[PDB]
């Protein structure tokens, strides 16, 4: 019966995308302590602060337990970058695998180059 407001959700999400390392996954109190630092963020009231902290401990569990959408974390961004940059070591893609459509051979003949002397079938 407790649904958070946009302000609570928005503040908490900046807290996680920035100070993810300071936050801990299951404990609200450690996350509340990070909120209490004040240098990281200004939180007016005790209840407002607890709500931002409470969402942030759920967010912390969720970001460790799989990716969470809309969470801009630099360390996770590097992890995809090595995965995206790496291509097969031998660059095995087409690998001269040939294989044509029966109509394609006639189209290749239409150009007149006739790749592989019509041995493409």
């Amino acid at each position: 019966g407790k649904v958070r407001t946009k302000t609570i959700k928005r503040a908490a999400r900046k807290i996680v995308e920035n100070n993810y390392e300071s936050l801990k996954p299951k404990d609200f109190q450690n996350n509340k302590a990070i909120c209490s630092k004040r240098n990281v963020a200004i939180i007016p009231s005790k209840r407002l602060r607890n709500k931002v902290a409470g969402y942030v401990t759920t967010l912390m569990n969720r970001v460790v337990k799989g990716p969470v959408h809309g969470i801009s974390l630099r360390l996770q961004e590097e992890e995809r970058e090595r995965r995206d940059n790496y291509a097969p070591k031998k660059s095995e893609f087409d690998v001269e695998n040939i294989t044509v459509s029966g109509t394609t051979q006639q189209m290749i003949d239409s150009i007149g180059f006739k790749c592989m002397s019509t041995s493409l079938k």
Binding site: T7, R10, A11, K14, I15, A41, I42, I43, P44, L48
Partner: protein, 102 residues
Amino acid sequence: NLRAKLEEAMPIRRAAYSIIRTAMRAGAAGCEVIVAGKLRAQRARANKFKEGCLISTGHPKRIFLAEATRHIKMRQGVIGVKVRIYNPNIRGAVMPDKIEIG
């Protein structure tokens, strides 16, 4: 200033528009002017001219607003002017919902 400006019979919209400017320049993010009565007519109406965003409810409203009520007198009858000025930067603290997150 408005009530006495209204007496010289200046345009009622112009009066509010000039007062609205001097509050925003002085810093108020929220400025609200409502003049209500038999203005240029034999019938009642209320004319709200407002520049900016003003909180209207709650504990911040009590300390962050400047509602002032005055009753102009006119041959037609009383055309009371109400001006409410909201300052988030009240220096007494912060807005309860204003999360700086800097």
